[PDB]
């Protein structure tokens, strides 16, 4: 009804917020006030990967820190050897409107998806010597935004129909469905323990989901526009988001509130990707103004600029050993930075 | 590269070069096709336009792809009517199509919206056309405007005058003037007349000449691309 319901809930919103104001003793900017800066971060382009013929929409690193996969909207998934710039596999897609791709932690499978509302799983270790479509997961009524492997037989996807799904690859059926967002979900990130994951949606909100039970644990607000990217802190106790309001934010799971804001008066374009370095001291973000910005995650200071792309930067990645960074743009090039 | 590589490294480089060759061949083949984006609003007649070429010439589904061939030219048409999500999150995926086909039903001027009883269907199609034409991703993309159901419009114009819509219309209330007036209001929404064109056809012609029209409207567009590609502009 309209009485004792949808109004008492507004009281609860006044309680949680109050509980969020009694835990804010100090701020992150004051705790890290008397610590040394990181200086100026200068990175050079070591490799340039050519061979795509349209805009690159997604990329993902392998767990060996040498092989990577990229997806272009010309119907191609390309697997690159980054040390020698050799092409290992070129997979033609049935639908060219791809918007996400993933690499299995074992290295035996890749995943793809896009405007066809289907997640395709490709096997890379066949006895026939070719890459063949292993599975096609269907059931989403909106476009596929992101997908991440949990193991060889589990995957989590986010869709534009305001939902997330945990699948069983061997059976092809949805195992768990996560609902509660108002707008389209645009990104997800798996925790290092795999037991939790965060998602950011077009309703300017992020949510934390427990995989093994399927219920929402916490909701985080504070942005003013759509959240386009999300990433976990290395220890799995915090995460970072990038929005369309030209701002990145850092949220803490245990503190249940926002910690730091990364924004500049010069920057007015949206943010497409975010990433952390191995220690978590640096935060790397990709922007629509063709540049990548490296922020000091503890002092909210812009430490560096990566500028080598003629169009907007659409995807970012940092290897597991923390050696190099990979950037992919709306031109047809991927760049490795050291 | 050179003599510092091993035998297996040389074989891997050879495989990479073969992959590059195949990629270039695929890109060259794909550059010769004509990609069209099909748009409309409600009962505009998109199914009738799609049925103009039923030959292949070669959960909820998101995008429907249709292939056909006319005069040794290959067309791929993309229908995105199924997509019920936020359009601004994926419209930029279609930046670079050859043209946008936009279907509008002429007879949808007396009827009003089902949910919004006090909203006109023609007005809704006009708002959609205004949003698409002046979009930031379609600055130099041409639009082929299809106006369907002229046979029903020429009969509905008798019982009901063209005053329920267009309150400032002063005309003879015949088909030959009302249709030309509607085309003028649809073409007046273009604010990029120095970079894009609108091609209008009354596609209640039951024959196949409709695709013929598209062919012509495509050829001109391609010419205007080459003039910019070759530096003339």
């Amino acid at each position, epitope marked *: 009804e309209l009485d004792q319901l949808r109004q008492e809930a507004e009281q609860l919103k006044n309680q949680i917020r109050d509980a969020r104001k009694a835990c804010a003793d100090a701020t992150l900017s004051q705790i890290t006030n008397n610590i040394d800066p990181v200086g100026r971060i200068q990175m050079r382009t070591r490799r340039t990967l050519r061979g795509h013929l349209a805009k690159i929409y997604a990329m993902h690193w392998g767990t060996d820190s*040498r*092989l990577l996969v990229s997806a272009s909207q010309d119907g191609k998934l390309i697997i690159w*050897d980054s040390y*020698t710039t*050799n092409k*290992v*596999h070129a997979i033609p897609l049935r639908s060219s409107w791809v918007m996400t791709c993933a690499y299995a932690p074992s290295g035996n499978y890749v995943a793809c998806g896009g405007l066809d509302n289907i997640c395709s799983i490709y096997n890379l270790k066949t*006895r*026939e*010597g*070719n890459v063949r479509v292993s599975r096609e997961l269907a059931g989403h009524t909106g476009y596929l935004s992101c997908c991440r492997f949990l193991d060889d037989n589990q995957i989590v996807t986010s869709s534009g129909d305001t939902t997330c799904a945990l699948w069983d690859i061997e059976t092809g059926q949805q195992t768990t469905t996560f609902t509660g967002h108002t707008g389209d979900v645009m990104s997800l990130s798996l925790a290092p323990d795999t037991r939790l994951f965060v998602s950011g949606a077009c309703d300017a909100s992020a949510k934390l989901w427990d995989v093994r039970e399927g219920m929402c644990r916490q909701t985080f607000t504070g942005h003013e526009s759509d959240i386009n990217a999300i990433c976990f802190f290395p220890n799995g106790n915090a995460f970072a988001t990038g929005s369309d309001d030209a701002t990145c934010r850092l949220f803490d799971l245990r503190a249940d509130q926002e910690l730091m804001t990364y924004s500049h008066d010069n920057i007015i374009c949206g943010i497409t990707s975010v990433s952390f370095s191995k220690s978590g001291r640096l935060l790397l973000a990709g922007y629509d103004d063709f540049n990548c910005n490296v922020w000091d995650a503890l002092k909210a200071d812009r430490a560096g600029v990566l500028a080598g792309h003629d169009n907007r930067v659409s995807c970012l990645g940092v290897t597991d050993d923390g050696m190099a960074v990979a950037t992919g743009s709306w031109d047809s090039f991927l760049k490795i930075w050291n | 590269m050179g003599c*510092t590589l*091993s*035998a*297996e*490294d*040389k*074989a*891997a480089v*050879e*495989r990479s070069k*073969m992959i590059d060759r195949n990629l270039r061949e695929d890109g060259e083949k794909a550059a010769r096709e004509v990609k069209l984006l099909l748009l409309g609003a409600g009962e505009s007649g998109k199914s009738t336009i799609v049925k103009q070429m039923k030959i292949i010439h070669e959960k909820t589904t998101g995008i429907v792809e249709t292939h056909f061939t006319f005069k040794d030219l290959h067309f791929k048409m993309f229908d995105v009517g199924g997509q019920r999500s936020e359009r601004k999150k994926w419209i930029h995926c279609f930046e670079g199509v050859t043209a946008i086909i936009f279907c509008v039903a002429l007879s949808d001027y007396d009827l009003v919206l089902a949910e919004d009883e006090e909203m006109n269907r023609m007005h809704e199609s006009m708002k959609l056309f205004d949003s698409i034409c002046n979009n930031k991703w379609f600055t130099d993309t041409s639009i082929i405007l299809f106006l369907n159901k002229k046979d029903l419009f020429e009969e509905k114009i008798k019982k009901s005058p063209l005053t329920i819509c267009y309150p400032e219309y002063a005309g003879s209330n015949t088909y030959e003037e009302a249709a030309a007036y509607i085309q003028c209001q649809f073409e007046d929404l273009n604010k990029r007349k120095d970079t894009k064109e609108i091609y209008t056809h009354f596609t209640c012609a039951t024959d196949t000449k409709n695709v013929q029209f598209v062919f012509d409207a495509v050829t001109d567009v391609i010419i205007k691309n080459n003039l910019k590609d070759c530096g003339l502009f």
Partner: single-chain antibody, 233 residues
Framework: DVQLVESGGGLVQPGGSRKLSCSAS????????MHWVRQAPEKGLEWVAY????????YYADTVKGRFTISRDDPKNTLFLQMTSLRSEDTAMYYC??????????????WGQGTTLTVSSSDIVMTQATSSVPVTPGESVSISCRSS???????????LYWFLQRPGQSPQLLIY???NLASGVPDRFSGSGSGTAFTLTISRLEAEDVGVYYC?????????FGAGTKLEL
């Protein structure tokens, strides 16, 4: 089911010509490089010829160069070896081998059944130094291979391969690049070594694992095998 079937062998007179055919079924024949290998009666293995994927690279052994020609027909999935001026040193049993080359691949992973040819009538040296050992089931044994040149390249790879040939069958891959275990091979097998000396451990023995073990190098394209270590009883 991967299958390679070889045909064209028979009794030939000293001097003459003969063509051997290798038909492949069950895999992507065009993506694999192909090798012709031979085994003399009661002798070891000997690499003969190699043709790349796409026919862009061809190699011959020094003992058959100028008289042997290797070719492939990819639409028909066939490999041909044309041999002319046959001597009494060419009577052997010939095997067709497939091998693919990219990062992390497993070359030399499948061999054919072989065809018998009978005539009426600096290269790296690989030493095994042991021709026969007695083994019993349940025990553990070791096989040693020695090279005349360091097989470790300046990229981290040591190119050494191990093959097992059971009585009456064709060789099969066990270990590639001195450490990796081939698909469908029990975990009992292991390999380890320095740049010059290498060791293969069988762990527990069974009714299987009885036959001849060979070590091969893949650093310089003139490919050489060991003498072969025999495991009896």
């Amino acid at each position: 089911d991967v299958q390679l079937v070889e045909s064209g062998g028979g009794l030939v007179q000293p001097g003459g010509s003969r063509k051997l055919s290798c038909s492949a079924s069950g895999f992507a024949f065009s993506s694999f490089g192909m090798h012709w290998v031979r085994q003399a009666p009661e002798k070891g293995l000997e690499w003969v010829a190699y043709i790349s994927s796409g026919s862009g690279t061809i190699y011959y052994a020094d003992t058959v160069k100028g008289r042997f020609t290797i070719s492939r027909d990819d639409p028909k999935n066939t490999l041909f070896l044309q041999m002319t001026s046959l001597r009494s040193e060419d009577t052997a049993m010939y095997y067709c081998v497939r091998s693919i080359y990219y990062y992390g691949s497993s070359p030399f992973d499948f061999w054919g059944q072989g065809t018998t040819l009978t005539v009426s009538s600096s290269d790296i040296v690989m030493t095994q130094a042991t021709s026969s050992v007695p083994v019993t089931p349940g025990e553990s044994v070791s096989i040693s291979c020695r090279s005349s040149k360091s097989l470790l390249h300046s990229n981290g790879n040591t190119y050494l391969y191990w093959f097992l040939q059971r009585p009456g069958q064709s060789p099969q891959l066990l270990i590639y690049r001195m450490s990796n275990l081939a698909s469908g091979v029990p975990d009992r097998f292991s390999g380890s070594g320095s740049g010059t000396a290498f060791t293969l451990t069988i762990s527990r023995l069974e009714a299987e694992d009885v036959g001849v073990y060979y070590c091969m190098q893949h650093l310089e394209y003139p490919l050489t095998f060991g003498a072969g270590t025999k495991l009896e009883l």
